Design a protein around this nucleic acid. Structure first.
Ligand SMILES: [Mg+2]
Ligand SMILES: [Mg+2]
Ligand SMILES: [Mg+2]
Ligand SMILES: [Mg+2]
Ligand SMILES: [Mg+2]
Ligand SMILES: [Mg+2]
Ligand SMILES: [Mg+2]
Lengths: 129, 83, 98, 218, 23, 129, 71, 83, 208
RNA sequence: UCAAAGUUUAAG
RNA sequence: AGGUUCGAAGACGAUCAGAUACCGUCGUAGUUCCGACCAUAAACGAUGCCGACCGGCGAUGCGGCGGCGUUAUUCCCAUGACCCGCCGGGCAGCUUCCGGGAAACCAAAGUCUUUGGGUUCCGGGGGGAGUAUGGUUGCAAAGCUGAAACUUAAAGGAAUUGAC
C-alpha cells in the first residue's frame, strides 16, 4: 500500500525528469514533501512549484527545468551521527563537489551542508544531484 | 568549469537542448540546431538576423521536436498565438 | 526458449478448457489449441454434378452441401499439410490464407 | 595525399576549422580519418589491447579471422576505441586504428576535493556498461593513480585521466566488451550535466554556416 | 528419463521399507 | 529454353542506344554493322548478339518508353508534357462545397467568402470488422 | 525481495545465518564431517608407515603409471 | 505532450476525467427540484436516487432508481440550477 | 511566422486551400498531431486548423530561408504525387530535389556517387519518405514534412498539417512554400500575385 | 489420406 | 450404489532378428453417482503479493455517462438491437531507440553501481539426491521435513555459422 509518501513523490518527479517533462503532478502531498522540494529549489534543481489544496490530503504541481539528474530517497530513515555523514555522502552522492543529502534534524529539514554548518546530526530523508 | 584560482578549464562547453536543458553529446548525431529567419515587419522579407534552437536527438526520436520548436517560436514571438 | 508468446494455445484467462479428441489421430487436445477447418462442400463434386443434374426428377434443383467442422491436432495437421511451418518472423501473421 | 569527400573534411583541409573542439561542439560526424590525424598529429598513439581470432564453420573446414581491439589517445583529453576484423592480422590492426581515430571522443576531467591545479581525475562517478560487463569510474584524490584492472588502466591513461578508483562487474574476461564498457564510461563524462554547466548556452554559427561561401568553392 | 528414474527410486524405497520391516 | 542474355550484352546495347538511337533501326543486319562501326566489340559472336538485343530494345522503344534508358528526344517530350498549365482548377468555379464544421473554421479565422454549405450524413459506421 | 525495515535486524541476521549453510565452503568448515573424514586430523602433514608400493594408472587422456605408496 | 499546464486545464477535458482523478476531486451528480403534474408540492430529488421517491402528497411516485441516474416517471419536470 | 499584418491569411489563399481539399485531413489521428486540428465531422474526417497550417508553413519557409546556400536544402518525394511538385519547388527555390526511389545511404556513405550532405530536408509524406528521414539522424539533418492527421512525427522537426494524400493538395502546399521562401527574400512582391500557377505543381494521372 | 530401416576404433 | 463407452493389467492377431511395444481384436481394475481419505501435476504466464509512477493505437467483456440517425411497435411514449464518443475497472492484442535485458524477449522482466516504497517465500558449480537417516502425517500408495561420505571441470542458458 501507499507506505512512504515522500518516496513515491520523489520517484515520480525523477521519472518525469527522465522523460523530458516540463511540469509534473504529485498526488498525495505532505509537509515533508513540500519541505524537500523547497530545499531542492534553493539549490536550483527545480522550478517554483505550487500546491493544490483540495479540502483533503492535497496535491502539488512542480515546474522542473531539466537540471535534476536524479532525486532519490533512503528508507529506512536512518539516523546519521555527523561522523557518519561523511561516509554517507561518499557512497551516495556522485561527487565531493555537487549533490546533497537532505536529512531532517532537530533544527529542520535540510541538506547536509546546512546541518554541518549548524553542527547537527539527524535522520536522512533522501538525496538529489 | 573554473578552478580554485578562477582560471577557466575544460576543452569545450557543450551545446544544450533548448527543449530539455539536456546536454547534446559530442557524438549525438541525431541532433539539430535549426536556424529560423526573422523579417523586417513592414514588408515580410528576411532581415539578416536569426533565431536558433538546438534539440537533442533523444527528443527527436521520441517525436516531440516539432512541438518543442513550435513552443520555442511562440515564446520568442516568431509564432503568433495559434488560438 | 519460448517459441510463441501465445503458446500455440489461445487460452489467456481460464486455467482450463474442455478437450477434443482429434478427427484423424483420435489424439486428445485442448479446444483452444488444435487446428480447425470448417469444411462446407458440395455432396456430389465437379465430376458427377452435371451427370446428376441430367438425371434428376426435380426441375433445376440446387443440390445440398455437406458441412463438417474438423478438429486436427498439431501432429496430424502438420503431417497432412493443413499447416506448414514458418520462419521466426512469419510465424506471427495470424491472418488466414486466401 | 588527402582529398576529402566530406564537406567537413574539405574545411579542415583548408585550415578553416581551427580545432576538433569546434567539430565536437556541433556533433558533426568525423568520417574522413585524416581530419583527426591532422588535428592530433603526434601525441596520438595506438595500442593494440587484444587480437582475438574469431572463426566460423563451413562445409570445408573453418574460416578464421582476426579481430583487433585498438585504443588510441593523446594522454591529454581524447581517446578512441576501434575494432576491426579481417582475414590477416595486419589489415585488421590497420583498419582498427582508423576506426579508433574516427570514434575518438573528448573526456571531461575534473578535480577531486580542493579544486586546485589542473583537472586530474573524473568529474563525477560516471559509469558505462556494455553487454553484461559494467564499469564504474570513481573519482580519486591526487597521486592515487589509476586503481584499476589492466584494460581500463590502459585506456584511462590514454584519456589522460591520472587518478581513478574503478569498479567492475560482469564477465570482464571478455576484453573487448570490458574496453567498450570503459569507453562508454569516459565518453559519458561530457554527457553529465553538473551544476558546473547550468549557464544557458550561447549558440554559434556551425562551420557549415560560417563557411558556406567557401564550401561553394570558388 | 527423470520420471522413470523417480519411479525406479520409489520402487527401490518400497523394497527397502519391506526389508527393514523384517527387523 | 536456353538463351538468355548476359549483362555484358544488355549493358552494351543500352549504352549503344543511349548514344546512337538515330543510327539504329528495326532491320537487324543494318544495325549489326552499325554496332561494328561505333563500338570495338572484340568477338564476332558477341557483336552479333548485342545487335540482336539492340533490335529488341528498338522494338520496345517504338511502342512507349523503356525504364532503364535515356533517349534525348523522349526526355525533352516528357519535359514539355509535364510543364503543362491549364486555366486552373484551384479556383473551383464560383461556389466551393463546404460543411458546417468547416464553416465554423472560417468563422474562427474571420471569413465569409463565396462557398456553399451542406451536410446531412448521419454517422454511418466506417469499414466492417 | 529484501526485508529492509529499520527494526528488522533479527530477521535479516537470522536469514543470512540460515543461508550461510548453502555456501559449500562454510558448511565444510563448520560441520565436523570433513575433520572426521580427513586422515590428517586437521593437520598440515602426517607421518605414516609405508605398507606397499602401488602403481596408480593415470586418468584417460594421459596414459602413465604413477607410482604411489600405500601409507 | 512535453508541456501541459496541469494547473490551468480546460473544462472540456475535466468533464471527461474520472470524478476522483480531476485536479480537485468533484462530484458528477446534482440535486433536482422535481415538479410532477398533479401535486404542486416541489420535491428535491438527488440525481442518483436509489430510493423510490414518493411525493409530499403521497399520491404518485417520481423516481424508479436504476443503476446510474434515477428514472423520472414520464410527466415529471425538474430543474438543476444550483451550486 | 508572425501572422501579425503582412504575411497573415487573406481570403484568396484560403479559397485555394479549400478548393484543394487540404483542410480535409484523414480518419485516423496521431496523438502528436492533435495540436493541429479543429474538429472531426460525421463519418469521421478530421479538420485541420488552417491558421495553424499557415503558421507552420511560414515557419518552414523561415527555416528554408535561413539555409544560406539554397542548393543544400534537399527536397524529397517518394510517392508519385509530390514527384513533380518537389522538382518544380527545387526549380523555383534553387534547392536540390530527390524525386522517387531514395537511395539508402545518400546522406550516409562518403564513398557513394550520390553522396549529398545537405543542411535541410523537405519530405512529402513522413510515412512514405521514411528512409531519408532516418538517415537524417545519422547526419545532423533537420526536417520539414507535409504531415496528415495519421502521420507520425519521428524526426520531423517542423511538420506542416495538410492533406498529403491528395495530389492537388500536396502540389498546392509545395507551391505555397515556394512562394513563401521566394517572398521572404527575393523576387515576389506579395502585393502583386505570382505568375506561376499552382496547377503547374499538380501530378498528372494519365489523362490525355 | 503414415509398412520395415538397429549399430558404428581402444588404436590419437 | 452403478457398470454405456473407453480401458492400465491380462489374453490373442499382426509387425519385427527379437516386440513381453507402436497397429488390430477382446478385456479386468478403473472410467460414472453418494459418503469418507489422499494433497500431488509442466498445479505454467515456468513470472510472490500490495503500492506508486513512465509511450501510442485500435479492438473486445461488464457497469455508468453523453450524443444524430437507423430498425422499429401501434400513432407518439418507454424501448431493447445497431451507430459514434467519454469514464471506471477486466481478458488480451498490435506498435516504437520508454527503459531494460546474456539474450530470446518484456510498457513490464521498465523507473538498478544515478543501487534503499512495503513485505513474504526462496537459490548459491555439477553429481551423489529429493537419497540415507531420524521426526511427523497417511488404511495404504505415499506426503512433508531432510543430510553426509565419496565423486567431478565443467554441467547449464541464450544466440550465430555450419553439418545433419
Ligand atoms: Mg492447469
Ligand atoms: Mg493394443
Ligand atoms: Mg478414480
Ligand atoms: Mg511441487
Ligand atoms: Mg528479474
Ligand atoms: Mg539493488
Ligand atoms: Mg549444488
Amino acid at each position: 500500500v501507499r507506505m512512504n509518501v515522500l518516496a513515491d513523490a520523489l520517484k515520480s518527479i525523477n521519472n518525469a525528469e527522465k522523460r523530458g517533462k516540463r511540469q509534473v503532478l504529485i498526488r498525495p502531498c505532505s509537509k515533508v514533501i513540500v519541505r524537500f522540494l523547497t530545499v531542492m529549489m534553493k539549490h536550483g534543481y527545480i522550478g517554483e512549484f505550487e500546491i493544490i489544496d483540495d479540502h483533503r490530503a492535497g496535491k502539488i504541481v512542480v515546474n522542473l527545468t531539466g537540471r535534476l539528474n536524479k532525486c532519490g530517497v533512503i528508507s529506512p530513515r536512518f539516523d546519521v551521527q555527523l561522523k557518519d555523514l561523511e561516509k554517507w555522502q561518499n557512497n551516495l552522492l556522485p561527487s565531493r563537489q555537487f549533490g546533497f543529502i537532505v536529512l531532517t534534524t532537530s533544527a529542520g529539514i535540510m541538506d547536509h551542508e546546512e546541518a554541518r554548518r549548524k553542527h547537527t546530526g539527524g535522520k536522512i530523508l533522501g538525496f538529489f544531484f | 568549469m573554473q578552478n580554485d584560482a578562477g582560471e577557466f578549464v575544460d576543452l569545450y562547453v557543450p551545446r544544450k537542448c533548448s527543449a530539455s536543458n539536456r546536454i547534446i553529446g559530442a557524438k549525438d548525431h541525431a541532433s539539430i540546431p535549426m536556424n529560423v529567419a526573422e523579417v523586417d515587419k513592414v514588408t515580410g522579407r528576411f532581415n539578416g538576423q536569426f533565431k536558433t534552437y538546438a534539440i537533442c536527438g533523444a527528443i527527436r526520436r521520441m517525436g516531440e521536436s516539432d512541438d518543442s520548436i513550435l513552443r520555442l517560436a511562440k515564446a520568442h514571438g516568431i509564432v503568433s498565438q495559434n488560438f | 526458449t519460448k517459441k510463441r508468446r501465445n503458446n500455440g494455445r489461445a487460452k489467456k484467462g481460464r486455467g482450463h478448457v474442455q478437450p477434443i479428441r482429434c478427427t484423424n489421430c483420435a489424439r486428445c487436445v485442448p479446444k483452444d489449441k488444435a487446428i480447425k477447418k470448417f469444411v462446407i462442400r458440395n455432396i456430389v463434386e465437379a465430376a458427377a454434378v452435371r451427370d446428376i443434374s441430367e438425371a434428376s426428377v426435380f426441375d433445376a434443383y440446387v443440390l445440398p452441401k455437406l458441412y463438417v467442422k474438423l478438429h486436427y491436432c498439431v501432429s496430424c495437421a502438420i503431417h497432412s499439410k493443413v499447416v506448414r511451418n514458418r520462419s521466426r518472423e512469419a510465424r506471427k501473421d495470424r491472418t488466414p490464407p486466401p | 595525399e588527402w582529398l576529402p569527400v566530406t564537406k567537413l573534411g574539405r574545411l579542415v583541409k583548408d585550415v578553416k576549422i581551427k580545432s576538433l573542439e569546434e567539430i565536437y561542439l556541433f556533433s558533426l560526424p568525423i568520417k574522413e580519418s585524416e581530419i583527426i590525424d591532422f588535428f592530433l598529429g603526434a601525441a596520438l598513439k595506438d595500442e593494440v589491447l587484444k587480437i582475438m581470432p574469431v572463426q566460423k564453420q563451413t562445409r570445408a573446414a573453418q574460416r578464421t579471422r582476426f579481430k583487433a581491439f585498438v585504443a588510441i589517445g593523446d594522454y591529454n583529453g581524447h581517446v578512441g576505441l576501434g575494432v576491426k576484423c579481417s582475414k590477416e592480422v595486419a589489415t585488421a590492426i590497420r583498419g582498427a586504428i582508423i576506426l579508433a581515430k574516427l570514434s575518438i571522443v573528448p573526456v571531461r576531467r575534473g578535480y577531486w576535493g580542493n579544486k586546485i591545479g589542473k583537472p586530474h581525475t573524473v568529474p563525477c562517478k560516471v559509469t558505462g556498461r556494455c553487454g553484461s560487463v559494467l564499469v564504474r569510474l570513481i573519482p580519486a584524490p591526487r597521486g592515487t593513480g589509476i586503481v584499476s584492472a589492466p584494460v581500463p588502466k590502459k585506456l584511462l591513461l590514454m584519456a589522460g585521466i591520472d587518478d581513478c578508483y574503478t569498479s567492475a562487474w560482469s564477465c570482464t574476461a571478455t576484453l573487448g566488451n570490458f574496453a567498450k564498457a570503459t569507453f562508454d564510461a569516459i565518453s559519458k563524462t561530457y554527457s553529465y550535466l553538473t551544476p558546473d554547466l547550468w549557464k544557458e548556452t550561447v549558440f554559434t554559427k556551425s562551420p557549415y554556416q560560417e563557411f558556406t561561401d567557401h564550401l561553394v568553392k570558388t | 528419463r527423470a520420471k522413470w528414474r523417480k519411479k525406479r527410486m520409489r520402487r527401490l524405497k518400497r523394497k527397502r521399507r519391506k526389508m527393514r520391516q523384517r527387523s | 529454353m536456353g538463351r538468355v542474355r548476359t549483362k555484358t550484352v544488355k549493358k552494351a546495347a543500352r549504352v549503344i542506344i543511349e548514344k546512337y538511337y538515330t543510327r539504329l533501326g528495326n532491320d537487324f543486319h543494318t544495325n549489326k554493322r552499325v554496332c561494328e562501326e561505333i563500338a570495338i566489340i572484340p568477338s564476332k559472336k558477341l557483336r552479333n548478339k548485342i545487335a540482336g538485343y539492340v533490335t529488341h530494345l528498338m522494338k520496345r522503344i517504338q511502342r512507349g518508353p523503356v525504364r532503364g534508358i535515356s533517349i534525348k528526344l523522349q526526355e525533352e517530350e516528357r519535359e514539355r508534357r509535364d510543364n503543362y498549365v491549364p486555366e486552373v482548377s484551384a479556383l473551383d468555379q464560383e461556389i466551393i462545397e463546404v460543411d458546417p464544421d468547416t464553416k465554423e473554421m472560417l468563422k474562427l479565422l474571420d471569413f465569409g467568402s463565396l462557398s456553399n454549405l451542406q451536410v446531412t450524413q448521419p454517422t454511418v459506421g466506417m469499414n466492417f470488422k | 525481495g529484501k526485508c529492509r525495515g529499520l527494526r528488522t535486524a533479527r530477521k535479516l541476521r537470522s536469514h543470512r545465518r540460515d543461508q550461510k549453510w548453502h555456501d559449500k565452503q562454510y558448511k565444510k568448515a563448520h560441520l565436523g564431517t570433513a575433520l572426521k573424514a580427513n586422515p590428517f586430523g586437521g593437520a598440515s602433514h602426517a607421518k605414516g608407515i609405508v605398507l606397499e608400493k602401488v602403481g596408480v594408472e593415470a586418468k584417460q587422456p594421459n596414459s602413465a603409471i604413477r607410482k604411489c605408496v600405500r601409507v | 505532450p512535453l508541456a501541459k499546464d496541469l494547473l490551468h486545464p480546460s473544462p472540456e477535458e475535466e468533464k471527461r476525467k474520472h470524478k476522483k482523478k480531476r485536479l480537485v476531486q468533484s462530484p458528477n451528480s446534482y440535486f433536482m427540484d422535481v415538479k410532477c403534474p398533479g401535486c404542486y408540492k416541489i420535491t428535491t430529488v438527488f440525481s442518483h436516487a436509489q430510493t423510490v421517491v414518493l411525493c409530499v402528497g403521497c399520491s404518485t411516485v417520481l423516481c424508479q432508481p436504476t443503476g446510474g441516474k434515477a428514472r423520472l416517471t414520464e410527466g415529471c419536470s425538474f430543474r438543476r440550477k444550483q451550486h | 511566422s508572425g501572422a501579425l499584418d503582412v504575411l497573415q491569411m487573406k481570403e484568396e489563399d484560403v479559397l485555394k486551400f479549400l478548393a484543394a481539399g487540404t483542410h480535409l485531413g484523414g480518419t485516423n489521428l496521431d496523438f502528436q498531431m492533435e495540436q493541429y486540428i479543429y474538429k472531426r465531422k460525421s463519418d469521421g474526417i478530421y479538420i485541420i486548423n488552417l491558421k495553424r497550417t499557415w503558421e507552420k508553413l511560414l515557419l518552414a519557409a523561415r527555416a528554408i530561408v535561413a539555409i544560406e546556400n539554397p542548393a543544400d536544402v534537399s527536397v524529397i518525394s517518394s510517392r508519385n504525387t509530390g514527384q513533380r511538385a518537389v522538382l518544380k519547388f527545387a526549380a523555383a527555390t534553387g534547392a536540390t530535389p530527390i524525386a522517387g526511389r531514395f537511395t539508402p545511404g545518400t546522406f550516409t556513405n562518403q564513398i557513394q556517387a550520390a553522396f549529398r550532405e545537405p543542411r535541410l530536408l523537405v519530405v512529402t509524406d513522413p510515412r512514405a519518405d521514411h528512409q531519408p528521414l532516418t538517415e537524417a539522424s545519422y547526419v545532423n539533418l533537420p526536417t520539414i514534412a507535409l504531415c496528415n492527421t495519421d502521420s507520425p512525427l519521428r524526426y520531423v522537426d517542423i511538420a506542416i498539417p495538410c492533406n498529403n494524400k491528395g495530389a492537388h493538395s500536396v502540389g498546392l502546399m509545395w507551391w505555397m512554400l515556394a512562394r513563401e521562401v521566394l517572398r521572404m527574400r527575393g523576387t515576389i512582391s506579395r502585393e502583386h500575385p505570382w505568375e506561376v500557377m499552382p496547377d503547374l505543381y499538380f501530378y498528372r494521372d494519365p489523362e490525355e
